[PDB]
C-alpha cells in the first residue's frame, strides 16, 4: 500500500469537474427560485435579529474547524480542507429540513441568500486570518485569492439568473421543482459512484477515523452552538431551532468545487472525498434530530 493515487488520467477528472460545475449552476438557480426582495425591504427594518444569526454562522464555522483541527493535531493540508468545509452557504438542504418539520421558510431562504452573497466578502478574509494559525501560516503563498473569487462569481451567476427571473415571468418555477429533485438525486448518485470508481486505493487514505469524527461532530457542534446562542439572545423557540439547523448544514458542493479547481488534484487527492462523507452525515443526523425533536415535543 502507501502508494500515491494512480493519477494522470484526465477524462475522469473532467467528468468530475463538469458534473460539479453543473450541480453548482442548478443549486444556485434553486436559490434563484426563491423570491426575497419583498422580504428584503420589510426585514431591513429589524434585521438585527437576522444579522445575529448571520454573523454567528459566519464566525462559529471557521473557529470550529480551527479548534477541531487543533485538538486532533490534524496535518496541515486536510485541516485547511476542513476550514474550507466549514465555510460554505449550505442553505437548500437546511430549507428542506425546516420545511419538512416546520417554520416560516421566508426567513430561512433569505438567510441562505444573504449568506451566499456575503460569503464572497468574508470568505477571503477568514481564510487569510485563520491560515496564519495552522502553525505559522505555511499556506500563505498557496491560497488562490483571485481564483477563489472566480469560483465564487461563477457560483453567483445563477443567483443573478434567478433574481432577474423574478423581474420577468415567475411562472417558470412551476416546472422548476420537478427538475430540481431529479437533478439533485442524479448528481448525488453520480458523484458517489464516480468518486468511488475513479480512485479506489486512495479512499483508504481518505477514511481515517479522525476525518470521520470531525465530519460527524463539527456540524453537530454547529447545531449546538446555534441553539445556545439563539437561546442567549431571547429569540423565540422556532427561530432558535431554524437558525441552529441552518448553521448545522453547509454547502458540500461549493467546498468540493473550490477544492478541485483552486488546488491541484494531487494536492487535494482523496481528501476531496471528505465533504461527501460530511454531507451524507448531516443528512443522517438532521433526520435523526428531527425524529428526536418530534419525540421531545410528545413527552
Amino acid at each position, epitope marked *: 500500500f502507501t502508494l*500515491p493515487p494512480n493519477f494522470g488520467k484526465r477524462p475522469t477528472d473532467l467528468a468530475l469537474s463538469v458534473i460539479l460545475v453543473v450541480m453548482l449552476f442548478i443549486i444556485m438557480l434553486s436559490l434563484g427560485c426563491t423570491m426575497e426582495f419583498s422580504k428584503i425591504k420589510a426585514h431591513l427594518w429589524k434585521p438585527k435579529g437576522l444579522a445575529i444569526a448571520l454573523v454567528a454562522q459566519y464566525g462559529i464555522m471557521p473557529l470550529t474547524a480551527f479548534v477541531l483541527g487543533k485538538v486532533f493535531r490534524l496535518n496541515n493540508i486536510e485541516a485547511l480542507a476542513i476550514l474550507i468545509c466549514g465555510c460554505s452557504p449550505g442553505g437548500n438542504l437546511s430549507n428542506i429540513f425546516s420545511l419538512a418539520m416546520k417554520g416560516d421558510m421566508n426567513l430561512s431562504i433569505v438567510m441562505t441568500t444573504c449568506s451566499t452573497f456575503l460569503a464572497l466578502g468574508m470568505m477571503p478574509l477568514l481564510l487569510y486570518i485563520y491560515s496564519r494559525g495552522i*502553525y505559522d501560516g505555511d499556506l500563505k503563498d498557496k491560497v488562490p485569492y483571485k481564483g477563489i473569487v472566480i469560483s465564487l462569481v461563477l457560483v453567483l451567476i445563477p443567483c443573478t439568473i434567478g433574481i432577474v427571473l423574478k423581474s420577468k415571468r415567475p411562472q417558470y418555477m412551476r416546472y422548476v421543482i420537478k427538475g430540481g429533485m431529479i437533478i439533485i438525486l442524479l448528481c448525488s448518485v453520480a458523484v458517489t459512484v464516480l468518486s468511488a470508481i475513479n480512485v479506489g486505493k486512495s479512499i483508504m487514505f481518505a477514511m481515517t477515523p479522525h476525518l470521520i469524527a470531525t465530519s460527524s461532530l463539527m456540524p453537530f457542534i454547529g447545531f449546538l452552538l446555534g441553539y445556545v446562542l439563539s437561546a442567549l439572545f431571547c429569540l423565540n423557540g422556532r427561530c432558535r431551532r431554524t437558525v441552529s439547523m441552518e448553521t448545522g448544514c453547509q454547502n458540500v458542493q461549493l467546498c468540493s468545487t473550490i477544492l478541485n479547481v483552486a488546488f*491541484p488534484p*494531487e*494536492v487535494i487527492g482523496p481528501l476531496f472525498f471528505f465533504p461527501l462523507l460530511y454531507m451524507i452525515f448531516q443528512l443522517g443526523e438532521g433526520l435523526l434530530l428531527i425524529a428526536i425533536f418530534w419525540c421531545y415535543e410528545k413527552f
Partner: nanobody
Amino acid sequence: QVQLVESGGGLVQAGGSLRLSCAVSGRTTANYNMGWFRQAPGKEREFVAGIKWSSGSTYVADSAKGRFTISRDNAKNSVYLQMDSLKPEDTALYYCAANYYGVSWFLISPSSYDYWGQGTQVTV
C-alpha cells in the same frame, strides 16, 4: 523560504554506490515532504523518491526499488539519498524539491513542489 543545495559528482558505470547529499538550509518546519527528481535530455522532471521530514516515512518509485533509498539527517539539516550501484542507463541531471504540504500519502506530481536547489548533473 528554505534554500537548497546539492552535492554529487558520481560519473561512473555500474558498481558505484554514489554518494548524493542535499544540504537543506531554511525553516525546517514540521510536515514538509522532500523529494528527488530527474532531467534526462529532452524529457521533463519526474518523481523518484521522497520522505516526510517529520515522521520519516519514505517511498520509492518503480525504477528505484531495491536500487535507491533516502536517509534523513534532521539534526544536521541534510537529506541523504544513497542510490545503489546502477546500470549505465540512468544518466541524468537530478534535483531536490520540498513542499510544506503535509499528507499521509506521497506527493508525486512534478508541478507541486516549490523549493529547488542547484541539482547536480551526474552520468552513469
